[PDB]
Design an enzyme around this catalytic site. Structure first.
Site, short mmCIF file in Angstrom:
data_model
loop_
_atom_site.label_atom_id
_atom_site.label_comp_id
_atom_site.label_asym_id
_atom_site.label_seq_id
_atom_site.Cartn_x
_atom_site.Cartn_y
_atom_site.Cartn_z
N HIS A 1 0.73 -1.27 0.00
CA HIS A 1 0.00 0.00 0.00
C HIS A 1 0.75 1.32 0.00
O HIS A 1 0.13 2.37 -0.15
CB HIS A 1 -0.97 0.01 1.18
CG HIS A 1 -1.82 -1.21 1.27
ND1 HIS A 1 -2.80 -1.50 0.34
CD2 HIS A 1 -1.81 -2.25 2.13
CE1 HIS A 1 -3.35 -2.67 0.63
NE2 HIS A 1 -2.76 -3.14 1.71
N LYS B 1 20.16 -3.42 -13.06
CA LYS B 1 20.67 -3.59 -14.41
C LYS B 1 20.91 -2.15 -14.85
O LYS B 1 19.99 -1.33 -14.86
CB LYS B 1 19.65 -4.27 -15.32
CG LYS B 1 20.26 -4.70 -16.65
CD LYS B 1 19.25 -5.36 -17.56
CE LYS B 1 19.89 -5.68 -18.90
NZ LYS B 1 18.90 -6.14 -19.90
N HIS C 1 18.20 -12.00 -27.95
CA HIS C 1 19.09 -11.02 -27.31
C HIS C 1 18.92 -9.64 -27.94
O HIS C 1 18.77 -9.53 -29.15
CB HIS C 1 20.54 -11.49 -27.49
CG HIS C 1 21.56 -10.50 -27.03
ND1 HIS C 1 21.86 -10.30 -25.70
CD2 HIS C 1 22.34 -9.63 -27.72
CE1 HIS C 1 22.78 -9.36 -25.59
NE2 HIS C 1 23.09 -8.94 -26.80
N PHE C 2 18.92 -8.59 -27.11
CA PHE C 2 18.80 -7.23 -27.63
C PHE C 2 20.22 -6.68 -27.70
O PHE C 2 20.86 -6.45 -26.67
CB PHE C 2 17.94 -6.36 -26.69
CG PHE C 2 17.58 -5.03 -27.28
CD1 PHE C 2 18.49 -3.98 -27.26
CD2 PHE C 2 16.35 -4.84 -27.91
CE1 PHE C 2 18.19 -2.76 -27.88
CE2 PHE C 2 16.04 -3.62 -28.52
CZ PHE C 2 16.96 -2.58 -28.51
N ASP C 3 20.72 -6.48 -28.92
CA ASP C 3 22.08 -6.01 -29.10
C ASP C 3 22.24 -4.48 -29.02
O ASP C 3 23.12 -3.98 -28.32
CB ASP C 3 22.63 -6.53 -30.43
CG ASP C 3 24.14 -6.56 -30.48
OD1 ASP C 3 24.77 -7.11 -29.53
OD2 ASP C 3 24.72 -6.05 -31.46
#
Lengths: 124, 120
Positions: free
Chosen positions: B12, B37, B115-117
């Site tokens: 809450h 991250k 995967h995000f390059d």
């Protein structure tokens, strides 16, 4: 083991949520605060006042809880709160909520020593 | 164990906006557990459009691998970067919404983004 494909979707895909934070607040918060795990919590209230002001409610107006218990207290003044209510199109794991901001008095149950809020009872 | 007081705070309390997006999404998508991250990108196009990138322009990944593909057109993405005062568990990000080409690594069978390059 989380598959690479599933990992990609979790870390980088957000197609469903609207770009308007005013509208997606509940979706994001309900998920961040772990209330969408296993089941989508139907309704939930978030309080935007200071922790000190919410804890101060424990020494204010005493009232009876909705469950018959007697350790409930009502805030002397209204507080900024956000109502999160599950929408019709909501379906776990795709939990969807409608965000509604209002200013009302809150009723919380207090416990422990020192006495602090341990349960959100209602808003009036 | 989570105490009753801690549970109340988690369920809450939210003391004190779209600039808050990354803070919440990073938390929701479990990328602020163990450590923050530093950077992450979220794509706002349909999953079908992102998967299609796996059959578009073939490029070399930043790490030297060769299974990377770049989108032929720009996509709406949100850039999340740790702020100057972030510190686990109190992670904090700067939200930046832009439109750019994305580069992803594809793998598996069928071949899909794994995967995000980067974005360009």
């Amino acid at each position: 083991k989380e598959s690479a494909a599933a990992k990609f979707e979790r870390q980088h895909m957000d197609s469903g949520n609207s770009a308007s934070s005013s509208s997606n607040y509940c979706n994001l918060m309900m998920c961040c605060r772990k209330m969408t795990q296993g089941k989508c919590k139907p309704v939930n209230t978030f309080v935007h006042e200071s922790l000190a002001d919410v804890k101060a409610v424990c020494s204010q107006k005493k009232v009876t809880c909705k469950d018959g218990q007697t350790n409930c207290y009502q805030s002397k003044s209204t507080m900024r709160i956000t109502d999160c209510r599950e929408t019709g199109s909501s379906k776990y794991p795709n939990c969807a909520y409608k965000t509604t901001q209002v200013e009302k008095h809150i009723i919380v149950a207090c416990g422990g020593k020192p006495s602090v809020p341990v349960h959100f009872d209602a808003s009036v």
